[PDB]
Amino acid sequence: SILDTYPQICSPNALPGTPGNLTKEQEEALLQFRSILLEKNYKERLDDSTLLRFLRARKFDINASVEMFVETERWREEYGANTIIEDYENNKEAEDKERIKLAKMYPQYYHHVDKDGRPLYFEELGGINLKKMYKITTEKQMLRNLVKEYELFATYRVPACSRRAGYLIETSCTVLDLKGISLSNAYHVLSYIKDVADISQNYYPERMGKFYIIHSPFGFSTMFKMVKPFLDPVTVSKIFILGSSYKKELLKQIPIENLPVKYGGTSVLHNPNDKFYYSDIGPWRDPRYIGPEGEIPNIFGKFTVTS
Numbered sequence: 292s293i294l295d296t297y298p299q300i301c302s303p304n305a306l307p308g309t310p311g312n313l314t315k316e317q318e319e320a321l322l323q324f325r326s327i328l329l330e331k332n333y334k335e336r337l338d339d340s341t342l343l344r345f346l347r348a349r350k351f352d353i354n355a356s357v358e359m360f361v362e363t364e365r366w367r368e369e370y371g372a373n374t375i376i377e378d379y380e381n382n383k384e385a386e387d388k389e390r391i392k393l394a395k396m397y398p399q400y401y402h403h404v405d406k407d408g409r410p411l412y413f414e415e416l417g418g419i420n421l422k423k424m425y426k427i428t429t430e431k432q433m434l435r436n437l438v439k440e441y442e443l444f445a446t447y448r449v450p451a452c453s454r455r456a457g458y459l460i461e462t463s464c465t466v467l468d469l470k471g472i473s474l475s476n477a478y479h480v481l482s483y484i485k486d487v488a489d490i491s492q493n494y495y496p497e498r499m500g501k502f503y504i505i506h507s508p509f510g511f512s513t514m515f516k517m518v519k520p521f522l523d524p525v526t527v528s529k530i531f532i533l534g535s536s537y538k539k540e541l542l543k544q545i546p547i548e549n550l551p552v553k554y555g556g557t558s559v560l561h562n563p564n565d566k567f568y569y570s571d572i573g574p575w576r577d578p579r580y581i582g583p584e585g586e587i588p589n590i591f592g593k594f595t596v597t598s
Contacts, residue, residue, distance in 0.1 A: 294338055296582040297453040301461070302407070308347045310339045310459055320351045327357050333364065340461055348496035348525070363494045372494075375439045376446065380588060387592035390436075391569075392427055394591060396420065398568035401448070402558065403549035405464035408456030409500045410448045410573055411549060412463050417471025417506075421479065430483050437487060441495050447587035451575035454582065462500030464544060466554070470506035477514045485521050492523055501544055502530045505537045505554075561598045570596035 300311025308317055324346060325337055342360075349355040367373050379386055398415040405411055444463065452460040491498065504511075511532070519527060533540050538555030550556020551567065560570065569591045574580045576587075576597045589595035 293450065293583050296584075297450045298456070298458045299339060300459055302456070302458045305407075305458075308343060308351070309461070310343055313343075317346070317351060320346060320353055324353055324356055327353070328360060331357075331361070333360075336364075340459060344461065344497035348492075348523075359493075359496070366494055370438065372438050372442060375435070376442050376588070379439055383588065383592075387590070389428070389432075391591055391594060393424070394568045394594075395566065396424065400567055400570050401573050402551065402567065402570060403546070403573055404452060404455075405501065405545045405549075407464075407500075408452050408458075408460050409462055409464040410444065410452055410460075410575075411545060412465045413468065413551075413567070414465070415468040415470070415568075417468065419472070419476070421476055430486065433483070434486055434490065438490060441490075441498065443587060444498070446584055447575045448573065450582055450584055451577070451580040452573070454580045455574040455577070462498055464501045465499075465503065466541065467502070467504045468506055468554075469504060469508065469511065472508065474508060474510055474514050477511070478517065481517055484518060488518075488521050488526070492526060497525075499526065499529045503537070503541065504530065504532045505541075507532055560596060562596075565596040567596075569594045572596070572598060 301309040303312065305312055307314075313321065321339065321342055324342055328337055328342075342356075345356045345360050345363075346353075349359055371378065395418070397419050398413065401410050401412050403411050448463075449460055515532070522530075531540070541550060541554060542556075545556070547556045549558055551558050560567065571587070571590060589597075
């Protein structure tokens with residue numbers, strides 16, 4: 292299997308409960324957890340990385356972890372997550388056309404990695420015109436896009452970044468740029484944010500590495516109080532709302548050469564005419580780190596910037 296072509300143990304200096312950094316009791320819980328799922332006849336996604344993510348999300352309470360894993364398998368099957376990349380590929384032409392329309396208005400792109408080797412993810416909400424967005428896309432479509440990325444993240448980005456880091460990478464480093472948004476719109480999209488939180492927390496536990504929110508307007512703390520209610524304790528702890536010193540905070544976690552110039556870094560596209568919202572640069576593009584899983588599909592079609 293592909294799991295054999297990249298590190299399956301995290302850095303020895305990663306958080307507790309991660310692959311290769313278990314206590315005796317955690318190691319035993321894992322074996323018992325996998326034993327129960329095997330007995331229930333599950334076959335897929337029973338690797339240490341996956342199972343430990345569920346165990347951590349439930350504090351190694353085995354039965355509560357089994358319930359969570361069982362529900363996730365059902366959901367993946369009913370929602371179509373198990374074939375989402377395949378389905379996308381079978382209709383690439385059309386999906387890419389739709390994707391390119393929203394790219395400039397709602398930038399979502401990966402750009403290298405943080406200091407621990409985690410994929411560096413950026414999203415800018417400032418140029419979003421809700422009226423125009425509802426006219427060209429739907430919330431369900433965007434949720435689909437989210438689920439597809441979780442799958443792309445696991446099959447392409449993780450193996451590549453892990454081979455480059457020399458150890459298992461299970462999470463990402465996300466930067467949410469809120470410069471230019473209206474709190475008004477923020478409140479208007481609460482239900483969508485709630486849907487994102489539910490998919491993430493229920494079916495993709497422990498995928499959050501670092502989550503920074505920069506350029507948030509005054510009074511964002513108020514609106515965020517509306518969001519915390521449906522976020523789990525661990526999720527909140529991974530979210531950091533930065534102030535005017537955000538650049539110094541980002542530079543502690545991200546190599547300056549990987550950080551875009553406008554965020555305090557020195558990273559520039561090889562062609563200062565390409566747009567960051569059409570880019571997908573990272574280890575998953577380096578032939579030296581791409582394995583039997585093959586290279587990740589190009590989300591922005593012919594426009595996809597791979598440098």
